[PDB]
Amino acid sequence: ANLWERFCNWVTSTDNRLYVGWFGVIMIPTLLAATICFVIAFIAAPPVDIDGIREPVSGSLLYGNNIITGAVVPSSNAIGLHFYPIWEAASLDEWLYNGGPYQLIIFHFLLGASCYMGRQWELSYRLGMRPWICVAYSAPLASAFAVFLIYPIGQGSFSDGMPLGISGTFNFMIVFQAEHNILMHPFHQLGVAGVFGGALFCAMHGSLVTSSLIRETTETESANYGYKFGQEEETYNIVAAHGYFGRLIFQYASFNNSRSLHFFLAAWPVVGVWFTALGISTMAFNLNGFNFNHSVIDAKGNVINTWADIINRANLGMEVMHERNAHNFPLDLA
Amino acid sequence: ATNRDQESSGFAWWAGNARLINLSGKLLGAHVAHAGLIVFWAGAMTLFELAHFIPEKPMYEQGLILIPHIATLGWGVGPGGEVVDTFPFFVVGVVHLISSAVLGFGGVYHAIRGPETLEEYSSFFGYDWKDKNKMTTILGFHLIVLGIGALLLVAKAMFFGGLYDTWAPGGGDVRVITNPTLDPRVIFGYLLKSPFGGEGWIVSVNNLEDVVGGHIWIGLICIAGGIWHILTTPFGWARRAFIWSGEAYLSYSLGALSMMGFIATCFVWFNNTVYPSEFYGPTGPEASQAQAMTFLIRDQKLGANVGSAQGPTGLGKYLMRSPTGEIIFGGETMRFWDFRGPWLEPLRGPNGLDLNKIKNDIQPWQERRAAEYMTHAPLGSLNSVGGVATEINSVNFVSPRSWLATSHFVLAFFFLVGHLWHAGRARAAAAGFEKGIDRESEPVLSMPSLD
Amino acid sequence: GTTGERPFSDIITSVRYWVIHSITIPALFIAGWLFVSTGLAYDVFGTPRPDSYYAQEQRSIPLVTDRFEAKQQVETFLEQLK
Amino acid sequence: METITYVFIFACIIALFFFAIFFREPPRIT
Amino acid sequence: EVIAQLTMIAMIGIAGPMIIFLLAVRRGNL
Amino acid sequence: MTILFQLALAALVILSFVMVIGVPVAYASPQDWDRSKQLIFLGSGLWIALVLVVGVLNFFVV
Amino acid sequence: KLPEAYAIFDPLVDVLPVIPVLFLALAFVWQAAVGFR
Amino acid sequence: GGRIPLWIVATVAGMGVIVIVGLFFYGAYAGLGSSL
Amino acid sequence: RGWFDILDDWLKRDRFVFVGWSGILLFPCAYLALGGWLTGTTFVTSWYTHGLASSYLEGCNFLTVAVSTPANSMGHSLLLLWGPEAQGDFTRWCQLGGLWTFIALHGAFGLIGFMLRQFEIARLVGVRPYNAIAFSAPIAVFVSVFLIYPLGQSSWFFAPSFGVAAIFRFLLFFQGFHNWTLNPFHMMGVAGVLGGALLCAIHGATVENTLFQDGEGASTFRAFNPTQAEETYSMVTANRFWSQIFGIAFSNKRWLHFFMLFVPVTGLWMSAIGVVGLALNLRSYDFISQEIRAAEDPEFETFYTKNLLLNEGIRAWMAPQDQPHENFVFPEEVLPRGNAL
Ligand code: CLA
Ligand code: CLA
Ligand code: CLA
Ligand code: CLA
Ligand SMILES: CC1=C(/C=C/C(C)=C/C=C/C(C)=C/C=C/C=C(C)/C=C/C=C(C)/C=C/C2=C(C)CCCC2(C)C)C(C)(C)CCC1
Ligand SMILES: CC1=C(/C=C/C(C)=C/C=C/C(C)=C/C=C/C=C(C)/C=C/C=C(C)/C=C/C2=C(C)CCCC2(C)C)C(C)(C)CCC1
Ligand SMILES: CC1=CCCC(C)(C)C1/C=C/C(C)=C/C=C/C(C)=C/C=C/C=C(C)/C=C/C=C(C)/C=C/C1=C(C)CCCC1(C)C
Ligand SMILES: CC1=CCCC(C)(C)C1/C=C/C(C)=C/C=C/C(C)=C/C=C/C=C(C)/C=C/C=C(C)/C=C/C1=C(C)CCCC1(C)C
Ligand code: OEX
Ligand SMILES: [Cl-]
Ligand SMILES: [Cl-]
Ligand SMILES: [Fe+2]
């Protein structure tokens, strides 16, 4: 056929070692630009004035960081939510000072990862698969959108997006707890049940299937060689795993249908992480965790502290120290 | 067993509404009945709000989301947003609730008694999902209905008493609109605006003339697309690009609704024109700016030369420059200098905030609005303790702006998830592998190895 | 398989079941209500009532400060309330 | 020296990625 | 007062289960 | 007529409360599709007329 | 406040907006009626 | 054994919890622990 | 048949709830830990130990009730009911914190019982005991955090109290005093928990989206017979999808489920090691090189230094009320605070 049909057929080829696809056509350049910029800024970027107060934070290895302390630093509070491409700076020197790399990285990354999601759907279509892997991936993607995009929107500044760094991430979590009491928020409690329960069920299923592997090997070889790739039959006795697990608890707390069991494995963490992503995304609009400060009082009206009041003493320490030079007026309203 | 069980329909009880895909009459009942529920809620909720309404408290101190929608349209309200007549709220309430019962009646008739399928009773109401001409015909009718609706808002603004205009002098007032903006350079300029800070895409619309004019254009656009579609059939290119199934059309609309919920979220958070702060409380940006104003006012009253006061960082303690040089309020609120509001713009000059106006022209109503807004900032706890996360119990307050923004984010997010679910599944079903892989012809097994 | 017991779907739908438990469940409920409405829960567990957290004019907490003098410390603090 | 070290290790991982993908044990259907 | 609230919502809420209940007796078309 | 308005308004409420339960049972009981056709039709007009009547009385006591 | 005429309906009005949730709860009562066929 | 249909007991039970929980949320605003 | 062999028969009977020898440890200790928790969150205070209300009775809700740790002044006392502190007085036992040791120790022994149960049932049924081995990680966490950590500290007071918000407090104490987020052992634990959740979701979604068409319905759950021979999904198509999407894929089903065991189990074990360190205040709190530089160069700032300033806030603002037995009195003027706030 003609040129454009050759190109189309290559793009959507199921014979390429890595699938490209139409989503891939956007994903590849945006992920490459994000990765290249991120690697160079992490190693060599000069200090960034994150809070807009002419107090630059050093985030790169060459300016005194290690792997744990380093980061790509969010762009200046002075910028807020304004778009700050390279071409809007008078010079690269200005762009680096005000944190331009952060914007470039997050935008190319949010776009690339969104297309990574679409690319998962796209290949599943070309292979004849059911299509909902990409739904599962939407839980982590939405999480990323929350800390890098939504939360800056609600608060008015990319200076309050999550930093690209190990310690930067901790910084973000601590300040979040003081400003929103996320620990007392049900959606983050749902997220913790999501991931603890994911881990638990992960270990459970691995241990249960591993426990019922069919003897196909000797004791001097890896049990793993009892399974051959593409083999017709199952390599474990699911009836036996149910028999074990049904007795460990009781017969109906246990799954004997493989399809129902694996759907539960998918849904538990995905839902829970949807909820914690929705939790960041709504604390972005200052609907915060439950507040039980001074919620118990005695017959006279003395405050009788609870554990919520002790949490609040901690929150208050975080509140009054963070960004110690950045507040001139007594309420920290964003 | 007219469908209605898993053996005949192929879907289990937890996906039972999928049994209605090719039962056009029962499906009609489901929609009408569900429309019943929406109109019911609009009715019951408004009466709840009226029954709980105290006219001497701000609307935003009382947990009201629907009465503010009615006030913005210019009913029940006077200068400054004062509630002058509650009777129109009652009327909106009752009329929806009554109407919900006929909708209710019509929906439960169609779902139970009426014909399961419409296609033999009448050739006009029955439809096949794959009929591309009949589908765009329904589309077109609804397009026209929507265009009519856009023009109702125009009717209200120009002929039937106007809209609440927070920018109206003397603190806002209802006002009839007579010069709608028709210049498409403005109307469509909004659409090409960047969604980023200082620009804000269509969320930046800040006067009612633009709002009314936009709804003239949209009404005429919808009415004309209706006719277009009623009369046309899809072209070849469109036929090859889309999936033509009932589930695919669902997924397309879940897509649309998602996008729209995200836009409403940002509208209610940033826009103080069609969401007047008189009614909804201050925007987050607005409350933050109001605090800087408040303490500028206090300290200047004590003798501070606020324009030359250098703060700890070296930046001005009250006033500083935006990165394009505008004079703006200092402090963390430097991120919010894009904020515009009728209480603040009197102090604005060509270079930003004007220091002579600050030294001379701040009226008590501005000092009052700034104190009010700073203490009704949209921060509060899930259980409605107002203020920052570390505040003590006392103030029972969460901004309507928070409730409305959080709620429609959640809802927009899950309708995106719905889109992906049903879009992918519609593709699978159309290619015929939605129930899994055919063991006898597994496609990957006919493919060359990757290595 | 069947471990041999009586199915639950079978028991709860049975009338004999509800004859018995139309009484016992509410009775336990009311016992528990009574447990608190009589004030009995306070004296069993040593939980302060709303009026016994502080003495009228004290703002300090009756914190136990000794391991072995501990049960005595609590008693002496319960006396300063009257 | 410390900067060089962190960058060296990061660089080795990226090279591992390349071989683990393109020079893997190919899966076959035994 | 709040008994009024609770008697109203007591009656409204049983309204639903009753329809189901009636139609079951009449071998209705559930 | 403060008393005849409260009368009609409960006539509305009790008639809604009736027809809320009654129309769905009538509709899915196959026995008396005909013994009840008349019924729901009369309640319907009764309901509607009642709404109009409450609607005009409102303006004599509002 | 409602108009003082309709004040007797204040407790019915306080419960009305929760009614749409009972429809979702009523659908489950219904499928339990039919055994989730 | 099976004289009272299961769906009935379900609704009864459910409306039973709904009440108890509803009361606990009421109590979050009344009396002990309401901040008042 | 000796009496031992007759008791064996009856304990290993196939009943709705299997008992076994393990049950003689499991069921009493678990019921009592559970029961003691319910009893204490419902009725018991922390007034004499902590200066806190902690029960439904006092007006706490589900998030703020706790069975709280005994007073610092009890040291590591077992706080037996018949011991020297309570002298058999149940009421005084509750007031002094005895339900906390009651729960702690009966739960310790109930977890033992649960693992032995996993061993007992696996033996009788004939499967390998990998689930019991997996449960070792929860036991490492429980022992490290609830037992070892307080035994290294001054008393049980500083262990975790059993409550939703009591545990949140514990998290923040650990940030402010131990800088626990900086600890590589916690970081490995995070990786194993988050990667466990990741493995959970991706394995579930993969199987659900490579199913073979084994029935003709749209609900695909009915096309599975637990006695069937065949794999219900396609390893081959799963492998191709992921090789092309992510570059690598599992090819071995056994390795894949062994990895699902390994990852979260190994994460929790690593985190437990770190907590044993913190039992001794052996923290990864600082980076000396950052501190030498920061002290000398007032323009050097990183996220590391910013986070320590927050830790300093947490300690001073929370210690007086969180450790009331220290009688900390901090005048307003000593409290660290930035500008304005
Ligand atoms: C509910 C609203 C709605 C819906 C669902 C449809 C749906 C449809 N229309 Mg109709 N249409 C509508 C309203 C609607 N229309 C109105 C109001 C008008 C009047 C303007 C029209 C005018 C119209 C025409 C003239 C045509 C359609 C056609 C179609 C079909 C193809 C759509 C398509 O390719 O999508 C969009 C898909 C694309 C691939 C377009 C790509 C272009 C870019 C990527 C999108 C942005 C373009 C946008 C106009 C400008 C951006 C604005 C920006 C500043 C924010 C489809 C059945 C086509 C058809 O088959 O005719 C019968 C056709 O030719 N419609
Ligand atoms: C907005 C919510 C909504 C709506 C409008 C519908 C509507 C419908 N469903 Mg779905 N459904 C829903 C939620 C909803 N469902 C949920 C949440 C579930 C999961 C539990 C299901 C599960 C489900 C299954 C499993 C099936 C349906 C089916 C149907 C259709 C026929 C039902 C039937 O025969 O009823 C028979 C029931 C009765 C006669 C009992 C009484 C019902 C009436 C409507 C009560 C109305 C009460 C109301 C107060 C009336 C008075 C007011 C009036 C005066 C205006 C109908 C169009 C069926 C279908 O597709 O058929 C082919 C089907 O098999 N649905
Ligand atoms: C989208 C809504 C919708 C649609 C498409 C239909 C379609 C149908 N219905 Mg249903 N129905 C509906 C809503 C709907 N109905 C509602 C709300 C009720 C309760 C009032 C009923 C009650 C009902 C019954 C009881 C019966 C039907 C019947 C029918 C069929 C013939 C009706 C006909 O030709 O009317 C002819 C049309 C006219 C005479 C035109 C005037 C109709 C009104 C006045 C138009 C007003 C439009 C309004 C201005 C727009 C705003 C509406 C609102 C959103 C504000 C047809 C399949 C019949 C059937 O199936 O018989 C077997 C039948 O017996 N319907
Ligand atoms: C599996 C059962 C079990 C286990 C392991 C425990 C374990 C414990 N309980 Mg709990 N307890 C149980 C059941 C159990 N309990 C039951 C059923 C109840 C309800 C009555 C309680 C009520 C209870 C209370 C109220 C308290 C405990 C306490 C304790 C702790 C101290 C126990 C102690 O000092 O024992 C001392 C006694 C023994 C160790 C028994 C030894 C048995 C003989 C005499 C050994 C000698 C044998 C001989 C020399 C050789 C003979 C050979 C043989 C063949 C015959 C410990 C954690 C205390 C606690 O938590 O405080 C912090 C506490 O106050 N328990
Ligand atoms: C189908 C179906 C369904 C659904 C259904 C629906 C959704 C329904 C709807 C319905 C509706 C939606 C209804 C409505 C109704 C209404 C009414 C009935 C009302 C009335 C009103 C009145 C009576 C008024 C009165 C008053 C006044 C006037 C004033 C003030 C006071 C008062 C308020 C009292 C279900 C899922 C369940 C199941 C299956 C099937
Ligand atoms: C009212 C108003 C206004 C106005 C408005 C307007 C005028 C608007 C318009 C609007 C518009 C104008 C819209 C547009 C839209 C578009 C869209 C949204 C698109 C979409 C598309 C798509 C989705 C596609 C897809 C695809 C592709 C791409 C390829 C192939 C396949 C497919 C087809 C799938 C203003 C602002 C002034 C003011 C305020 C008010
Ligand atoms: C059954 C089952 C199976 C699985 C386990 C589970 C525990 C979930 C379970 C339990 C289910 C339970 C607890 C569900 C409860 C169902 C109930 C309470 C549903 C109630 C439905 C009631 C409805 C709509 C009533 C609508 C009434 C209407 C219009 C009111 C209209 C009125 C208005 C608007 C003005 C005044 C006049 C009037 C007529 C009152
Ligand atoms: C909240 C919610 C949301 C989802 C839906 C759902 C309906 C499930 C729901 C409802 C949940 C509710 C409210 C649950 C409430 C359950 C409660 C409070 C359980 C209470 C059980 C308490 C028990 C056994 C207590 C037993 C105590 C024991 C032996 C005591 C043992 C002893 C102790 C402690 C000290 C020495 C003496 C002795 C005897 C050794
Ligand atoms: O930057 Mn980052 O952090 Ca959210 O609040 Mn305001 O701002 Mn700043 O302070 Mn707190
Ligand atoms: Cl900080
Ligand atoms: Cl500030
Ligand atoms: Fe598996």
mmCIF file of C-alpha atoms and ligand atoms in Angstrom, chain A residues 51 159-160 175 179 322-323 327 332 334, chain B residues 332 335, ligand 9:
data_model
loop_
_atom_site.group_PDB
_atom_site.id
_atom_site.type_symbol
_atom_site.label_atom_id
_atom_site.label_comp_id
_atom_site.label_asym_id
_atom_site.label_seq_id
_atom_site.Cartn_x
_atom_site.Cartn_y
_atom_site.Cartn_z
ATOM 1 C CA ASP A 51 8.763 29.341 48.367
ATOM 2 C CA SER A 159 5.349 25.307 44.923
ATOM 3 C CA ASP A 160 3.078 22.985 46.944
ATOM 4 C CA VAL A 175 3.274 19.518 55.885
ATOM 5 C CA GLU A 179 -2.407 21.428 57.036
ATOM 6 C CA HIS A 322 7.359 24.734 58.190
ATOM 7 C CA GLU A 323 8.440 27.415 55.736
ATOM 8 C CA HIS A 327 4.309 33.740 56.603
ATOM 9 C CA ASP A 332 -1.833 29.806 56.782
ATOM 10 C CA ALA A 334 -3.097 28.000 51.499
ATOM 11 C CA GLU B 332 2.432 33.544 50.893
ATOM 12 C CA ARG B 335 0.671 33.071 44.582
HETATM 13 O O1 OEX J 9 4.298 26.719 50.645
HETATM 14 MN MN1 OEX J 9 4.293 24.977 50.829
HETATM 15 O O2 OEX J 9 2.912 25.141 52.592
HETATM 16 CA CA1 OEX J 9 0.524 24.974 51.740
HETATM 17 O O3 OEX J 9 0.159 26.340 53.555
HETATM 18 MN MN2 OEX J 9 0.721 28.017 53.188
HETATM 19 O O4 OEX J 9 1.490 27.254 51.722
HETATM 20 MN MN3 OEX J 9 3.227 27.128 52.228
HETATM 21 O O5 OEX J 9 2.358 27.443 53.983
HETATM 22 MN MN4 OEX J 9 1.647 25.988 54.838
#
